[PDB]
Structure formats: structure tokens, C-alpha cells
Amino acid sequence: VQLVESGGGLVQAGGSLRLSCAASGIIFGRNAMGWYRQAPGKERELVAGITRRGSITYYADSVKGRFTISRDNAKNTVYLQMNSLKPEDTAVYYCAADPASPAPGDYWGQGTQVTVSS
Amino acid sequence: VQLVESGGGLVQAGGSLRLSCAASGIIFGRNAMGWYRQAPGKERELVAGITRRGSITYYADSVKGRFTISRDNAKNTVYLQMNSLKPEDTAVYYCAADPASPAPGDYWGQGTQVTVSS
Amino acid sequence: AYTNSFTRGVYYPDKVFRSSVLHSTQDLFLPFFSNVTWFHAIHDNPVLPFNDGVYFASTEKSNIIRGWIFGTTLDSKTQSLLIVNNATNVVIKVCEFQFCNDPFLGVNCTFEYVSFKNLREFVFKNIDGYFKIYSKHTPINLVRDLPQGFSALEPLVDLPIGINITRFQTLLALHAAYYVGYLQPRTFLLKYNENGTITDAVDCALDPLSETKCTLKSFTVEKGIYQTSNFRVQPTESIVRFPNITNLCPFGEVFNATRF
Amino acid sequence: ASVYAWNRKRISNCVADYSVLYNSASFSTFKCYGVSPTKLNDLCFTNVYADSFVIRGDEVRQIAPGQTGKIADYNYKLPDDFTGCVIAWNSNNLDSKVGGNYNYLYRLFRKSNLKPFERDISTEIYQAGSTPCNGVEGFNCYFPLQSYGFQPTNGVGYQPYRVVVLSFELLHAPATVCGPKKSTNLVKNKCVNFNFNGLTGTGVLTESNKKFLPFQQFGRDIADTTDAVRDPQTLEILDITPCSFGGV
Amino acid sequence: SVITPGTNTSNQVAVLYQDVNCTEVNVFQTRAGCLIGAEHVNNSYECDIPIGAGICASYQTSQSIIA
Ligand SMILES: *[C@@H]1O[C@H](CO)[C@@H](O[C@@H]2O[C@H](CO)[C@@H](O)[C@H](O)[C@H]2NC(C)=O)[C@H](O)[C@H]1NC(C)=O
Ligand SMILES: *[C@@H]1O[C@H](CO)[C@@H](O)[C@H](O)[C@H]1NC(C)=O
Ligand SMILES: *[C@@H]1O[C@H](CO)[C@@H](O)[C@H](O)[C@H]1NC(C)=O
Ligand SMILES: *[C@@H]1O[C@H](CO)[C@@H](O)[C@H](O)[C@H]1NC(C)=O
Ligand SMILES: *[C@@H]1O[C@H](CO)[C@@H](O)[C@H](O)[C@H]1NC(C)=O
Ligand SMILES: *[C@@H]1O[C@H](CO)[C@@H](O)[C@H](O)[C@H]1NC(C)=O
Ligand SMILES: *[C@@H]1O[C@H](CO)[C@@H](O)[C@H](O)[C@H]1NC(C)=O
Ligand SMILES: *[C@@H]1O[C@H](CO)[C@@H](O)[C@H](O)[C@H]1NC(C)=O
């Protein structure tokens, strides 16, 4: 119902960038949450996710060595840390439950833009 | 739908304490309103009440000589004044209509705690 | 080894008094002339399946058989039932209990209750959480197999417990013959005498004569031809045919459209 | 209880006053199926069951016979022939919490739909994908239960509701639960308007020779008219003869 | 349909499957249908239990059903 994102911005490839988001309990209480991304030329994909219980994490293989996913159950927030960003990582990043519906009614936040230059 | 209480606090037996509350017109417009109380070891009871019309008051006999009930129809508030409080009067006090339902859906406010020491 | 169910396994299906009437009902009854399995706790008491109601009987002298267990895995995971006569009186309890697979007598929770010469005949079923126990106790002159003849069993116990029963075991005292059969969803014509006791019954699907007896609502059939049922050839397999289209249509596209 | 693991409590051996709930005007819904509200006080039931759980407001509409949806199919299914009352009310000031009440759970993932009135409290990881999960969360592997995370600032569709589903066993079997009625005395050989545990009719009560077995409560005719009863207070059997009538 | 002597004489019965082939169901194929359990004979009698299309059945001699 309510999803927000922040921590985006323009960086040069390399360095680091930390994304953050938050959700109302309706989504935050779901079995697992993570981050998704989109960019011109490519559809939406799940980058990384963390469960609600046990803080179990998993990553897409393509991002496994540079992305870290974490959550804070006291704050009702989720974070994604990128270490050494590449130009290919330019995308709008979104907060959502790990399972998600393709239906237009499955709510998404606006997303936050991450841009990585040469 | 909205009931609030205040004027509680810790006092030594004797002295005085004035409780106050307010309600939305939904409850304030009822035929009569008053104060109820609860405490560990004892269930909820009506202490005193005042009607909407004629400012007619009545008290439980057990409290008749130390409690005074009043209301203000311009302010949409109800008050209960205690003169010389006793240790037995330690309770959480609540604002509600004089008639009330035992059903869980009959709305009550949080109540305010009055504590009386030796 | 097996025995022949010679009209045994019939009981009063409801709590309504009927008399001097032939009444057609449907319930879980021991099919007439079914194969009942022999067991002996001599020299075992295997855990047996509970299909959809079970028929039991035992031959006795000294109350060597004193109880039973009904449940599933019997290792404290779900609700299961223990009934023991205790050679004193009856105690019944249902909980997530851990059982021995070899329980014996010598010579989280939902329910608790505290209360050859002959044969004990009884049945069990569990409908909508209610464990229903029916029985009779009669003398016998037979020393191995089960007696022939008909007399319906009466309800004794009817309890809303919610017990999950897929398996069971017979409890005996040790220092031993009993039978287990199964009930089926069959239609019966039950004959109630003037005192409302069921004295006879017709198993409506045993053979064509019994079928005729149920059709005519009678235990006596006159000479002639009766039309009792229809013969229908059954399908042996199903056939499903649709054009072999591998194309998908744009349903998502009318919901995920950029503009409406 | 959480809806995925709803509680059940049995009601028996009592006088059941249903006016206390019905006329409280404290419920968002009080929908009865098979019986009308206020008629309940004139009825007798064998057992009465009260199922209880917490769901969100938009889901109250799923607690119905013949209904479908995530709760109706994975958490709490009612049968098409359900007889009973679905009673529910808003608990936004009780169950909702600041920061979110994550104690209440519902099942989102299941292999198949539920049967009427069952429960499934398994925590087995749901095999959404093709690669076996083997008990561990991951891509296309999900913990089956979700929390509601109820907050006081949510709109109504997401506010918690407390639901009690009251199931009525209107069976021929002897009643254990009856409404708040008072009894009168028996007469014999007179025409009366009778009511025995909810069984009504007009007839002449006489002493019966139809000994009823210890578990039997009434006798019945060919036409389903009863013809004998076991009195609710005294263990004797009465016959019911229709009051005389004929053409004129 | 079930062809039977009265039950006060015998519990043996014969069964007629009306208007069907015996290949689809001591078997006699006739116009009435497939008659199973009655023994067809080359003798004659008057009629006891009629079946149809000129065929009757009866119970006789140690006794069995004949057609
Ligand atoms: C009693 O326990 C058994 C398991 O031992 C349950 O059986 C399963 O039921 C589900 C129904 O959705 C089937 O899909 C499974 O294949 C069954 N498993 C096995 C091993 O048979 C049974 O449903 C439980 N029953 C109650 C309370 O009636
Ligand atoms: C039942 O027992 C008889 C022997 O009395 C045997 O011929 C028959 O095959 C048995 N039936 C089954 C299903 O085992
Ligand atoms: C009762 O059941 C709960 C699970 O709902 C389990 O954690 C607990 O250990 C059980 N208690 C006993 C005594 O078996
Ligand atoms: C019915 O009960 C009477 C005793 O009241 C008894 O004499 C009679 O034989 C019984 N009838 C049957 C069929 O058992
Ligand atoms: C179904 O299969 C036949 C045989 O290969 C083919 O001729 C026909 O076009 C197919 N139908 C579709 C819808 O592809
Ligand atoms: C049936 O047989 C019995 C002897 O068992 C006899 O007494 C009775 O009269 C016979 N009834 C008919 C209709 O033949
Ligand atoms: C039964 O089928 C056979 C062929 O298999 C045929 O010759 C015969 O006439 C058929 N009988 C009837 C009654 O249809
Ligand atoms: C009838 O007679 C024929 C010879 O004409 C023979 O083949 C057949 O088997 C006889 N059938 C019976 C029932 O006697």
C-alpha cells in the first residue's frame, strides 16, 4: 500500500552507494523482501532479497559479489549496499516483497534512480 | 468512536484529584455520560454519572460522599472530582456513556490511571 | 487367514425410534459376507489401517483383550486416542501422546474421560470429528471363528474429539484371538420388530436377489420379474482434445497497458 | 488466533442467550445462514461451535459459504451448506499497534485448496520454482505464512477484524444447547400446542409403550411427522396422537 | 431385471439384461436381451414367468431355472 525509496544518485563507477527503503507493515510483514531494478533496454528483475525470519539472504549470481542485502525489523526498513558500482548497474531500484504478482494492481513505489558513469 | 482521558497521576491519600475527559458528539450526545473504573482484583463499575439534559446526577453509594460528577456541553467534556482520595480508589478511570454494551465492539478510550498511596 | 461376515456388523444408524417397519438407510456397515482378518497375540498385534470405519470382534474367557489405540503416527505429532478398560473401569484420553509400538498390560490435548465363553462385537467410525462406538456382548458356543446370526449393535459412545485415525492397535494383557474387518458406504433395508430392535437386514448390493428385496422394500419376493436397476457400460479412459496451439494471447497487455 | 491457525471452542450443556450478541449493535456484520437472527433463542442445537480468528477488513467478505479468495481457500473455508452466523467487528484500537502488529499470520502459499473447516499449520517451504527448496528460503522458495503488520494508521480495508464463526448443529440428536426458555408442566390426554427442545406441533400426549433405547430421543412416522418423544426433564416416553379432525 | 421363483421356494435367480448383446455384459442370447443363469432347454411347457419374444422361464427339476 505504501512503499518509498531513497539513497539513489549519480556516482562514478567504483566507490559505493547505499539504497534504502521503507514499507508499511502490510508489506514489511511478508515472508521476505528485497530490491528489484529496471533500466532502458531491460525489464524488471530481482537483484537481492532477505527473509523476515532468520535474516536469510540470497543474490542473483550476476550481482552476488558486489551487492549486500539487509533489513531492520525495528525500523520497518530494507537496505541494499553496492560496493564498486558498474555502468551496467544504472537502473531504477524498487522496494517490494520477494514474491510478487505481474498484475497492475500489485503495488510498487516510485523507485529511486541510480546512475553510474564511466 | 473517540474517547480520551486525563487528569490522572499519583497522590497520597487525602488531598484531591480532578479527572477530565472528552468525546466526539457521537458519544457526547448520548442521554447520559459518566465515569467507570477498573483495578487489579476488581472488574469495571460505574462510579458516577450525569445526564445530558437537566444535569441530573447520581453516584454509586460507596463513593457518594467523596466523588462529584459534572459536564460541560459547550466543551463536549465530562469531569469527575475526587475529594480526599483513599487507597481503594486506585484504578484506571474511563469515559463512556452511562448505558453501555458488554460487547467488545462498544468503544472505550484508553483510560487514565489514578494511584493513591498510604 | 480370513472369516466370513455372516450378517454381523450392523447397528442402529440414528437416534430415532422406529418399529414394525422396513426402513431404507445409508451408512457405513460391514458388507454382508465380507472377508474379516484373523489375528492372534501369541508366540503379534500389528498396527492395522483404519479405512473408513472398522469392524472388530473378539472371543473371550478372562478379558485378555482390554483395549485399543486409534491414531496416525502415534509419536506426539497429532491427536490420537487411547481406550483402556484397565480391568477396573474405563479411561479414555486423547492428546499428542508418544506411544510404545509394543504397549501392553500385565497379568496439545483435546479430551479426557474417566468412568471360549462369549464374544464382544463392536464397530468404530469417525464422522465430522465424532468418534462413534457401537457394541453388543453375547454368549458363544464356538471356540475359534465368529458366530453366525443377526442382532444389531447399540451406540455407547459418541464423542466430538477431532482425532486423526488412519491406523490402530489392539491392547492385550501378557504373561488372544480377535478379528478385524472394514465398513462400507452401503444401502441397507433394516427390519425393525415391534420393540424397535433390528432383527434382520438386506445388503442392497450383495447380489441380484438382495437388490430385488431392497427395490420392493421387502424381505419376501413373489414369483415374477422385477426391474431393479440399469446396466450401463462405463468409460475406461478419458480423451481430451484441443487444437495444438502454442501461441499465447495478450491478456497481460490489456491490464499492463501504459494508457487506457 | 491467527487465521492460518484458527481456534475452535465447543459450546455444550448450557442455556445460550443469543440476544446479548445480536442486539449489542457492536458488530460490523452479523450474517446468519440457514437461521434468522433473533430466532436463535427459540432453537436447540446439539453442539455449537465458535471458531475465532483475526483477518484484515477487506477479507471479512471471504468468510462465507461458497466463497473464494486467499482466506477462503488457504486459511478458513466454509461449506456450501453451512448453517451458522458470521459475526465480526473492528479491532483497530486493540490489535493494531504502532510500528505494526506482526503477530497475526495468514497463509499465502499452499499446494492446493482447503477442505471445509480444516487447518494447515505446516511451515514447509513452498516450492514455487523447479529446484527443490529442501526447507530453505531463496529464489522461488517461500515461507508460507505472512504477517499482517496491522497499524492504527491503515485505512479500513487493512484494519484488523475479529471474527467469530458460530456453527449450529441442527440435528435430530439430543440437544445440549438451548435458548433462554422457561418450561411448563406436562398433561396427558388433552390437545396441546407443544414444544420439546424445539420440536413443535399440535397433538395429544399419552403414555407410550414404545420403549426407546437409551440413546433414542423421538420416534418418527412415514411422513417425517414425529410420533413419540422422550421428555427433556423426566425419562418417560410420550406418544403424540394428532388431535381429532374430520370432514364436515 | 431379476427373474425369480418366489423366495419361499428358492433363492436362486436369473438375470436379464434387456436389449443388449451377451458379448458386452449358462448364457442365452435372445430378443428380449441377454439371459444369464437360466438353462435353455429344447422341451416345452406352457408359461410361468414370461420374459418376452416367445420365451418364458420356470423353476423345476435338484431344481434350477430354465428358459
Ligand atoms: C491425517 O494425517 C494424514 C497424514 O498421515 C493426512 O493425509 C494427507 O492429506 C493431504 C490432503 O491435502 C494429501 O494431499 C496427502 O497426500 C495425505 N498424506 C498421506 C500420507 O496420506 C490427513 O489429511 C489427516 N487428516 C484428517 C484430520 O482428516
Ligand atoms: C475370502 O475367503 C475365501 C475362503 O473362505 C477365499 O476363497 C476368498 O478368495 C477370500 N476373499 C478375499 C478378497 O481374499
Ligand atoms: C504443544 O504444541 C506446541 C506447538 O503448537 C509445542 O511447541 C509444545 O512443545 C507442545 N507441548 C507439549 C507438552 O507437547
Ligand atoms: C417385545 O417385548 C415384549 C416384552 O414387553 C416381549 O414379550 C416380546 O417377545 C418382544 N418382541 C420381540 C420381537 O422381541
Ligand atoms: C495439430 O497437429 C496437426 C498434425 O501435425 C497439424 O496439422 C495442425 O495444424 C495442428 N494444429 C495447430 C493449432 O497447430
Ligand atoms: C413358506 O414356507 C413355510 C415353511 O418353512 C410354510 O409354513 C409357509 O406356509 C410357506 N409360505 C408360502 C407363501 O408358501
Ligand atoms: C453380438 O455380436 C456378434 C458379433 O461379435 C453378432 O454376430 C451377434 O449377432 C450380436 N448379437 C446381438 C443380440 O446383437
Ligand atoms: C437342441 O438341439 C440341437 C440339435 O438340433 C443341439 O445342437 C442343441 O445343443 C440342443 N439344445 C438343448 C438346450 O438341448
Distance E54 CA to ligand 8 centre (A): 18
Q: How far is the CA of C52 from the centre of ligand 1 (A)?
A: 14
Kindly list the distances between the CA atom of residue D70 and the CA atoms of A107, C131, D234, in Å, as whole numbers in the listed order.
17, 32, 50
User: Given the CA of residue E20, which atom of ligand 7 is nearest to it?
Assistant: 13
Chain A to chain C Cβ contacts (< 8 Å): 5
Identify how the structure was determined: cryo-EM
Residue E20 in contact with ligand 8 by CB distance below 6 A: no
CA-closest residue to ligand 3 atom 4: C108
Query: Using a 6 Å cutoff on CB, does residue C194 contact ligand 4?
Result: yes
- C17 contacts in D (CB within 8 Å)? 210, 212-213, 216, 218-220, 228
Q: What is the CATH number of the domain that holds B55?
A: 2.60.40.10
- Assess whether the C-beta atom of E26 lies below 6 angstroms from ligand 7: no
D146 and A CB contact within 8 Å: yes
Asked if C113 contacts C196 with a C-beta cutoff of 8 angstroms, the reply is no
* Domain containing residue B79: 3-116
Q: Which C residues, 227 through 256, put their C-beta within 8 Å of a C-beta on chain A?
A: 252, 255-256
Whole-angstrom Cα distance, residue C156 to residue D218?
18
**Which sign, positive or negative, has the C-alpha torsion B22, B26, B32, B34?**
negative
Beta bridge partners of D150: D101
- Pocket, ligand 1, Cβ cutoff 6 A: C 72, 164, 166; D 112
D19 touches chain B (CB under 8 A): no
PDB resolution in Å: 3.0
Residue E2 with chain C: CB contacts under 8 Å: 208-209, 211-212, 225-226, 228
3-state secondary structure string, D117-142? Answer: CCCCCCCCCECCCCCCCCCCCECCEE
| CA atoms within a 13 Å half-sphere pointing along the CA-CB vector of A92 | 16
Q: Residue C93 falls within a domain, yes or no?
A: yes
C249 within some domain: no
Q: For residue E37, what are the contacts with CB-CB under 8 A and spacing of at least 6? A: E12, E13, E14, E15, E26, E65
DSSP chain C: -EEE--S---B--SSEE--SEEEEEEEEEPPTT-EEEEEE-------EE--SSEEEEEEESS--EEEEEEESS-BSSS-EEEEE-TTSS-EEEEES-B--SS--B---EEEEEE---EEEEEEEEEETTEEEEEEEEEE-S-SSSPPP----BEEEEEEE-----SEEEEEEB---EEEEEE-EEEEEEEEE-TTS-EEEEEETTSSHHHHHHHHTT-S---SEEE------PPP-S-------------SGGGTS-S--
DSSP for E5-32, written as a single string: --TTT----EEEEET--TTT--EEE-SS
Q: Is the residue at C39 inside a domain?
A: yes
Q: Residue B110's closest chain D neighbor by CA?
A: D93
Cα–Cα distances in angstroms (integers) from residue D21 to residues D16, D29, D40, D169, in the given order: 11, 11, 11, 19
Touch between chain B and chain C: 3 or more Cβ pairs under 8 Å: no
Cα separation, D84 vs A104, whole angstroms: 37
Note whether B102 contacts D24, CB cutoff 8 Å: yes
Cβ–Cβ under 8 Å, residues D122 and D201 = no
SS3 for B8?
coil
Residue with CA at minimum distance from ligand 2 atom 11: C35
For ligand 1, atom 22, the nearest C-alpha belongs to: C164
Please tell me the distance from the alpha carbon of residue D136 to that of residue D159, in angstroms, as a whole number: 32
* Residue C153 included in any domain: yes
DSSP character string of D52-108? EEEEEGGGGGG-SBT--SHHHHHT-PBPTT--EEEEEEE-TTTT--TT-B---EEE-
Of C15, C155, C158, the CB nearest to D172: C15
Q: How many other C-beta atoms lie within 10 A of the C-beta of residue C145?
A: 16
Ligand with the closest atom to the CA of C4: 2
CB count in 10 Å sphere of residue B1 = 9
Determine contact: B1 vs chain D, CB below 8 A. Answer: no
Task: Tell me the sheet residues that pair with D107.
Answer: D145
The total of structural domains in chain A comes to 1
Angle at E52 between CA E51 and CA E57, to 5 degrees: 30
Count of domains for chain C = 1
**Which atom of ligand 1 is found nearest the CA of C162?**
27
Q: Residue A104 carries which DSSP code?
A: T
Q: How far is the CA of E27 from the centre of ligand 8 (A)?
A: 14
Contacts of D88 (CB under 8 A, 6+ apart): D27, D28, D29, D60, D63, D161, D162, D163, D164
Are C17 and D173 a contacting pair at CB < 8 A? no
Element (H, E) at D19: helix D19-22
The single-letter code of the amino acid at A111 is: G
A-D contacts at Cβ under 8 angstroms? 67
CB contact under 8 Å between D139 and A29, yes or no, is no
Residue D143: list chain A partners with CB under 8 A.
31-32, 51-53
Asked whether C250 lines ligand 5 (CB < 6 A), one says no
| Ligand 7 proximity of E23 Cβ (cutoff 6 Å) | yes
Cell numbers for D105: 499470520
Nearest to B63 by CA among B79, B77, B83: B83
